[PDB]
Design a binder for this molecule. Sequence first.
Ligand SMILES: O=c1ccn([C@H]2C[C@H](O)[C@@H](COP(=O)(O)O)O2)c(=O)[nH]1
Ligand code: SF4
Length: 219
Amino acid sequence: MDREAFVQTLTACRLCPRLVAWREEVVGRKRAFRGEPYWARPVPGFGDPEARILLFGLAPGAHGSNRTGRPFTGDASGAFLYPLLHEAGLSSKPESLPGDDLRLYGVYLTAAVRCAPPKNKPTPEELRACARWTEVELGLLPEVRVYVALGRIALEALLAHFGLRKSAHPFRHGAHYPLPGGRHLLASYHVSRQNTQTGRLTREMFLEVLMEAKRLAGL
Ligand SMILES: O=c1ccn([C@H]2C[C@H](O)[C@@H](COP(=O)(O)O)O2)c(=O)[nH]1
Ligand code: SF4
């Protein structure tokens, strides 16, 4: 199927009972955004349809992409990620807001799970379920040369997708695994608030990951 079909069928998905309920249940839960329109549905990837770099997150934030409808947009993750994408020379502007004219240069953003999970922690069953969408979504991006896993779970999802052993591709910030055909898998700490607020993942550290992705992608 093409992108239009992918988005239409993905957004209708109701496979995970806990997530179908939660993505809607959280609407209005945060008073700060109560009254605001909520996507409250599976989140389609965002970016260059001819991307050479793919950033792979874990799952939507209840009041982030589950609210705005665009990956990482609306919460702490996007506040950290989007400005760095711009500094790395991979986007048109530092901020990401639904309905804006933001464009990514050869980069596409998505995640292993596409519906907001409680505690931002999907279950193995939910991860196994959404893998069907990872197959469809990555199938629409044949030009990708570098896959950047944001966190251990995202890395494991990519390893499963490519039939790679967890043992031989351990998770650590800065890990780099070459794949057949000049492709590359890069691992980074997730850009969640926990890692960024504590300093575990610094802005310079993430910019370094993006610069490496650019180099490896021939950008
Ligand atoms: O090179 C490209 C082309 C389109 N996109 C995405 C960005 C927007 O969501 C739409 C196009 O938005 P617009 O600014 O209206 O041309 O598709 C991108 O990220 N990079
Ligand atoms: S997480 Fe994925 S598989 Fe589960 S309901 Fe959402 S879109 Fe469907």
